């Protein structure tokens, strides 16, 4: 509603892992052929059409936007699961929270190595651009040398 009227919104889904379970339950009860891990065949398309609705409208349509922050749970840091892979292949990035870092005292446990933002510096303010650009190189060198 706010996107189509020149305003910006943030949508948080906590969490898509359980929506997939609910959809699988509904499909199985209604006699749908099970797929991988008993999930329905069109389980990717569900999240794919859910997350494609978050966009940045052009100036001709108002300029509003919706930002999506879907949340997904893994088991023993296994990102090879079915729905986890599907969601990773849909979003424009990922903030991977590592269990080992969380217990090691690092909070938020953002694993910079496994995290990525495909938008890049385009989504940064002019003030933050230079600081982040130099910081990325410094951290990369520190991790390599460490």
């Amino acid at each position: 509603y706010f996107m189509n009227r020149g305003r910006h919104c943030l949508c948080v889904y906590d969490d898509l892992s359980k929506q997939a379970v609910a959809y699988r339950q509904i499909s199985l009860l209604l006699r749908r052929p099970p797929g991988r891990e008993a999930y329905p065949g069109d389980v990717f398309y569900l999240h794919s059409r859910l997350l494609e609705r978050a966009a940045m409208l052009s100036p001709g349509k108002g300029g509003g936007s919706v930002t999506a922050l879907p949340i997904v749970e893994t088991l023993s840091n296994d990102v090879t699961a079915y729905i986890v892979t599907n969601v990773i292949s849909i979003t424009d990035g990922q903030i991977y929270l590592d269990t080992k870092l969380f217990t090691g005292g690092q909070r938020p446990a953002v694993n910079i190595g496994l995290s990525v933002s495909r938008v890049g510096s385009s989504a940064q303010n002019a003030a933050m651009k230079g600081v982040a650009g130099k910081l990325k190189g410094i951290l990369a060198e520190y991790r390599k040398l460490a």
Binding site: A38, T103, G104
Partner: protein, 489 residues
């Protein structure tokens, strides 16, 4: 009021395992309705069915609470006019019930004021409570790393014979006996001998004073019971707990052992209902059943329910759908590991895989939080170092890495504790460590003031004072041995 379908006559149309289909000429009663089989059938006990599905406008699929032996087609069935209801009130205190609410202790009639259906709607958002406290259990690992919250939901995850039952008994002894409010022990798919042992223990400790006022209720559907009763004993026990919480505003303790058997029974019945299995082979409604059951186990604005649930992990596979789905429904999670138990460390809690909700400086004291975080960091670093140690050796570490390894080994030994209920297995008097003592001892150990104390002094002891006493005894023995060796010259 009286139900409009009470006394409705139906006939058994199909029998497969514990699932029976009943045909009603005037229309199938509402789902969850309780039906009774009227035909004698030469059975030794009555037969009761619960409607779980509607096949059509006249046929309904039901699950039997007793064995369906000697059950023929066309057998007459009569509706009871409502769901399965169980006794509630103070009249149930000190008694032993089954899934149907019948007293199985062979004592006088219950004479309850009223009964309530086992199936009920969970509390709404407006009824939720916002109270956070700390429940002192007397166990160093739990009180330190994963403190329990009063009125919260607790879970113990573990394999077969890891120590789930022992921890539950220790918690019962250390809390329920000295508990102001009431308690409910729900046995779901566990050994029947354990129920007898618990009943004897309660009677001996006067927790259940048959000649006076009792403060506990026992509801037991055990392994021998068919899958129908093992999927509803939990509902009945939780209904009694809900009555105590709401109708009296009383604090209640709900010990469920084991909650995994509930999901297992649901899966077994679902396989017969003709449903497509989910992954592994569980019913597609695994998450929904746990959600409906757990959401009822909560503390509202009227009363509080502190629930301790034992979760069985089949084949030690913690990723199994049943235990995996239970994590999201718990305030405190206690994960037990078989390898830890095999090393002589009891309890076998794996602190790195455990978590608590009240691990917050706004709830627990600042010193408690800092000490717990430091212990977790030390254990995490030691686990990382163990990968190198197990390949090359301890001597291939840095100078400070050796210090971390020694401190972490002492921490691992120190986390062990002899329980007052495991004296037979441990052969040692149990300990009850105060919360403050645990924090002080662990804070001192982290600082390094106990580097001189031997590593084994921390094994199977209580507070720091016990550690020092054991170290003194070990030093005396070592001095005696050294004196004997020297005199041999």
């Amino acid at each position: 009021p009286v139900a409009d379908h009470k006394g409705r006559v139906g006939h058994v149309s199909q029998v497969i395992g514990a699932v029976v289909d009943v045909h009603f000429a005037d229309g199938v009663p509402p789902v969850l309705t309780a039906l009774d089989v009227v035909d004698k059938l030469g059975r030794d006990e009555p037969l009761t069915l619960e409607i779980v599905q509607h096949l059509d406008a006249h046929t309904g699929r039901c699950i039997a609470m007793q064995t369906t032996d000697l059950l023929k087609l066309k057998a007459k069935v009569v509706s009871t006019g409502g769901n399965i209801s169980v006794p509630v009130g103070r009249e149930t205190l000190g008694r032993i019930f089954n899934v149907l609410g019948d007293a199985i202790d062979q004592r006088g009639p219950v004479g309850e004021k009223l009964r309530m259906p086992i199936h009920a709607v969970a509390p709404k958002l407006a009824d939720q409570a916002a109270e956070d406290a700390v429940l002192t259990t007397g166990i160093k690992v739990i009180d330190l790393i994963l403190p329990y919250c009063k009125g919260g939901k607790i879970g113990l995850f573990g394999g077969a014979g890891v120590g789930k039952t022992v921890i539950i008994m220790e918690l019962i002894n250390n809390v329920a006996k000295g508990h102001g409010g009431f308690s409910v022990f729900a046995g779901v798919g566990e050994r029947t001998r354990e129920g007898t042992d618990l009943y004897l223990e309660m009677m001996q400790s006067k927790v259940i004073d048959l000649k006076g006022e009792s403060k506990c209720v026992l509801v037991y559907g055990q392994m021998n019971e068919p899958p129908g009763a093992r999927a509803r004993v939990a509902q009945s026990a939780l209904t009694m707990a809900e009555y105590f919480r709401d109708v009296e505003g009383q604090d209640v303790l709900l010990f469920i052992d084991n909650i995994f058997r509930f999901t297992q029974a649901n899966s077994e019945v679902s396989a017969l209902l003709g449903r497509i299995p989910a992954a592994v082979g569980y019913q597609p409604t695994l998450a929904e059943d746990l959600g409906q059951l757990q959401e009822r186990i909560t503390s509202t604005t009227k009363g509080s329910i502190t629930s301790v649930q034992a979760v069985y992990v089949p084949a030690d596979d913690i990723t199994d759908p049943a235990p995996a789905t239970t994590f999201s429904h718990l305030d405190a999670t206690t994960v037990l590991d078989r390898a830890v138990a095999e090393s002589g460390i009891y309890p076998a809690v794996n602190p790195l895989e455990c978590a608590s909700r009240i691990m917050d400086p706004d709830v627990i004291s600042v010193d408690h939080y800092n000490v717990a975080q430091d212990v977790v960091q030390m254990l995490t670093k030691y686990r990382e170092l163990q990968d190198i140690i197990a390949v090359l050796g301890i001597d291939e570490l840095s100078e400070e890495d050796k210090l971390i390894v020694d401190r972490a080994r002492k921490l691992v030994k120190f986390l062990s504790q002899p329980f007052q209920v495991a004296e037979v297995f441990t052969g040692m008097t149990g300990h009850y460590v105060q919360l403050d003592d645990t924090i002080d001892s662990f804070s001192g150990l982290l600082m390094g003031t106990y580097d001189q104390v031997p590593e084994m002094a921390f094994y199977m002891v209580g507070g720091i004072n016990s550690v020092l006493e054991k170290a003194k005894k070990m030093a005396e023995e070592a001095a005696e041995l050294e004196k004997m060796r020297r005199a041999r010259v």
